[PDB]
Amino acid sequence: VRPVADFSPSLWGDQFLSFSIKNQVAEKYAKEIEALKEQTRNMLLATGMKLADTLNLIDTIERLGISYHFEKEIDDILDQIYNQNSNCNDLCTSALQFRLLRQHGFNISPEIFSKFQDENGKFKESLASDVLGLLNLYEASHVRTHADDILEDALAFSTIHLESAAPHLKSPLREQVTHALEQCLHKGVPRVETRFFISSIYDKEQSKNNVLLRFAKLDFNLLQMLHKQELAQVSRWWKDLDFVTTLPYARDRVVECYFWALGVYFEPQYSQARVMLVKTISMISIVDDTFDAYGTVKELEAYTDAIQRWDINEIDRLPDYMKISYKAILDLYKDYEKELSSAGRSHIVCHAIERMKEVVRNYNVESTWFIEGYTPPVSEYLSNALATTTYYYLATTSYLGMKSATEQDFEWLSKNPKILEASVIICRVIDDTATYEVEKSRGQIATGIECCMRDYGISTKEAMAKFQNMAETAWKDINEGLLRPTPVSTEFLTPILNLARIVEVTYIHNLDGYTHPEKVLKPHIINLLVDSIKI
Ligand SMILES: C/C1=C\Cc2ccc(cc2)NC/C(C)=C/CC1
Ligand SMILES: [Mg+2]
Ligand SMILES: [Mg+2]
Numbered sequence: 001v002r003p004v005a006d007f008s009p010s011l012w013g014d015q016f017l018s019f020s021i022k023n024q025v026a027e028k029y030a031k032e033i034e035a036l037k038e039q040t041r042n043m044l045l046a047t048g049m050k051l052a053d054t055l056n057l058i059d060t061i062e063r064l065g066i067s068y069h070f071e072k073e074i075d076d077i078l079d080q081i082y083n084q085n086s087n088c089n090d091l092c093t094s095a096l097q098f099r100l101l102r103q104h105g106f107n108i109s110p111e112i113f114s115k116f117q118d119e120n121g122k123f124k125e126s127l128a129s130d131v132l133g134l135l136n137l138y139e140a141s142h143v144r145t146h147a148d149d150i151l152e153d154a155l156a157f158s159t160i161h162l163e164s165a166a167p168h169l170k171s172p173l174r175e176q177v178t179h180a181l182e183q184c185l186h187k188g189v190p191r192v193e194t195r196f197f198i199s200s201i202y203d204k205e206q207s208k209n210n211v212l213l214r215f216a217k218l219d220f221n222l223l224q225m226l227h228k229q230e231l232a233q234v235s236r237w238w239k240d241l242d243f244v245t246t247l248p249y250a251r252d253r254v255v256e257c258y259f260w261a262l263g264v265y266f267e268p269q270y271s272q273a274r275v276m277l278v279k280t281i282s283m284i285s286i287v288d289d290t291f292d293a294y295g296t297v298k299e300l301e302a303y304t305d306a307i308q309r310w311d312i313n314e315i316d317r318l319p320d321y322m323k324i325s326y327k328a329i330l331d332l333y334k335d336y337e338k339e340l341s342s343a344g345r346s347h348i349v350c351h352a353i354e355r356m357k358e359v360v361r362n363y364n365v366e367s368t369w370f371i372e373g374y375t376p377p378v379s380e381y382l383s384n385a386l387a388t389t390t391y392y393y394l395a396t397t398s399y400l401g402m403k404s405a406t407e408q409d410f411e412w413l414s415k416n417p418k419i420l421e422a423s424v425i426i427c428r429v430i431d432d433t434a435t436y437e438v439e440k441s442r443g444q445i446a447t448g449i450e451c452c453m454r455d456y457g458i459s460t461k462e463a464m465a466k467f468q469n470m471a472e473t474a475w476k477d478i479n480e481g482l483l484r485p486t487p488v489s490t491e492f493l494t495p496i497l498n499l500a501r502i503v504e505v506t507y508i509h510n511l512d513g514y515t516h517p518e519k520v521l522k523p524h525i526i527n528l529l530v531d532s533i534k535i
Contacts, residue, residue: 003249005293007515010244010252011522016529017239019232021225029222036215037069043211044073051081051088055096060209062100063185064202064216065194068267075104082106091116091133095140102143103186105484110148121150123157131165134158135177142186145480146473172204187475189263189505190498194220195527199534214535221532226268230275231258231529237279243286246324250289256517257281259525263502264398264495273401276339279332280352280397284359284390286325291363295322297371304364308357329356336400343403351410352400355393362387369446381451382428389427391499395420398495405492412488419481419493422474423500429467429474434507436460475500 043057058074061067067074082101088094094112101108117123127133138158144151159181166177179200185193198216202208238254261278291300303322306314312330315323333349340346365384369376376384386392396413399405413420432448439447452463478500482493506513506521513520 001294001296001299003293005249005289007249007251007289007293008518010255011517012255012525014235016228016231016235016255019225019228021229026222026225029218033215033218033222036211036218039211040066040215041070041073044070044077051086051097052090052093054081055093055100058100059096060202060212063194063197064212065190065198066212066216066219069219078104078106082108089115091127091130092136095133095136099136099140099143099186102140102479103482105482105486105490107483110150113150113154117150123153128161129165131162131169131173131177134161134165135180138162138180139185142184142475143479144476145483146476147480172201175204176201183505183508187501187504189501189524191262191266191528192505192524195533217533217535221535223266223268224529224532226271227258227262227266227529230271231255234258234275234278238282241328243324247286247290247321249294250286251515253285253514253517254278254282255525255529256514256521257285259521259528260502262528263505264394264498269403270401272339272403273398276336276401277394277398281390281394283325283329283332284356284393287329287360287363288390290322290325291367297367300364300367304360307360310353310357340400345403345405348400348405348407348410351414352393352397355396358387359390359393366446370444373445375445375454376451377455378448378451381446381448385428385432385448386421386424389424389431391424391427392416392420395423395496395499398499399492402491404489409488409492413492417481417487419478420496422477422481423496425474426471426478426500427503429471430503430507431512433464433467434510434512436464438512 040061044061049057054077058067058077061070061074078101081097086097088097089112094116098108098110098112116127123137135158137154141151141154141158162177162181166174166181168174169177179196183193194216198213198220202213202216235254243250244252258274258278260281261274264277265274290303295303299319299322302318303326306318306322306326307329310330312327315326318326333353336349336352337346340349362384366388368374369384396410399409399413428448436447436449440450444450449460449463449467452458452466453460456463456466458466478497482490482497486493505524508520511519517525
């Protein structure tokens with residue numbers, strides 16, 4: 001109750017509080033899109049297309065962010081391509097084939113890349129002057145599984161040569177290439193990459209397809225109207241409880257939390273789900289700050305205890321300010337119960353609650369360790385720190401609003417499947433690398449990186465690197481987790497992959513973009529939620 005937190009306040013003020021949809025623009029946009037959608041569908045169903053032209057078609061529709069209209073169409077075509085083991089075998093076309101099929105769960109063999117390597121298993125340097133090939137190899141290299149050692153040098157090979165070529169390339173290729181080196185496609189946030197592709201690249205293409213371009217622009221701008229509605233409604237919900245003033249020790253980041261929810265899914269069909277999810281993110285952010293930047297060892301115990309018991313009767317046992325958090329929390333979940341009552345999917349809230357209880361227990365442990373000055377071995381540290389990412393919790397939460405999610409889906413998730421552990425590890429390891437210094441100067445001894453130095457007996461940098469490996473292993477596990485046959489439908493894997501993406505995108509350049517949103521998140525939020533795409 002006496003630590004002075006240097007949390008910058010919300011960048012946004014009330015600018016998101018009111019949004020009145022221009023129903024006439026909306027209906028106009030919607031009507032034209034039906035037509036462009038249909039034309040685009042026929043583009044996909046065109047018969048007798050070259051392989052390379054079909055893959056570029058699907059890639060472009062995917063990068064323009066409109067692929068969610070043609071899930072069946074795009075699937076059938078990739079299925080067909082997979083089962084054909086094909087005979088268009090230039091580097092460009094092969095790497096793109098590999099990437100698209102793999103991203104869709106088709107376990108295409110990495111043997112396709114042998115024709116491009118010497119007898120030493122190294123990529124032929126004679127390819128260093130095929131820039132489009134190098135670019136697609138580069139993107140493909142980020143979808144490695146552990147079975148794909150054949151690609152172990154694709155990333156360094158393509159990188160060194162893209163770097164060397166980039167400055168002399170025409171536009172917008174030069175810009176595409178430069179952006180890819182900064183942010184690969186597979187690990188970027190979908191809305192972020194789509195907005196960059198439409199405005200910065202495709203729109204400046206000499207060969208651009210006008211139908212697809214108009215389509216992409218109207219759709220993005222139309223969905224954005226929805227997100228703005230969601231954000232506004234969520235902004236009033238955040239307002240009508242005023243933790244801004246009530247709980248001034250906490251980070252005020254509901255816009256940043258909505259961005260997180262939007263990264264997990266952007267499709268209109270997940271509107272209910274996004275709104276539930278972002279509420280949870282906001283709330284848990286509060287609890288996190290509570291344990292970490294204000295409440296006392298004594299108060300936290302009462303808090304954890306109450307959370308585990310989960311009944312209002314316990315409020316009185318908590319100091320006045322924790323009564324606020326605590327009731328809001330309990331209400332939020334009764335709200336969820338109401339929203340889901342309509343469809344009789346109300347029972348499923350308990351899975352999310354159980355995961356929240358878990359997070360809090362581990363927050364309390366993390367606190368005990370801080371007081372005692374305990375520096376666990378990495379094993380023990382991880383056994384506790386993984387859940388305090390909140391990622392088991394958010395992933396579970398992300399299913400609430402999803403109308404098709406069943407009990408078997410939650411029963412899979414509850415077992416900590418490998419794809420979820422990987423996403424959780426990526427978040428943990430990235431947050432620890434980014435926040436090493438600030439937490440260490442603030443009297444932290446239980447820091448993940450400290451445990452790693454003290455445990456293995458290695459420098460701050462040697463520990464930084466081991467953590468990077470864990471994240472890289474983790475991505476290979478995510479990539480392997482998407483391959484068919486999948487343990488649950490792909491729709492329930494994507495949010496977990498997306499959770500991994502958001503942490504990569506937000507901690508880019510190794511900085512806590514959530515706590516300090518100005519450098520990185522702000523531009524994203526502006527491009528996704530403030531500015532429309534100029535038609
Ligand atoms: C970096 C994250 C963990 C630390 C923390 C906890 C909870 C919040 C913020 C910070 N909420 C939003 C999330 C899930 C951000 C990524 C997780
Ligand atoms: Mg924290
Ligand atoms: Mg950390």
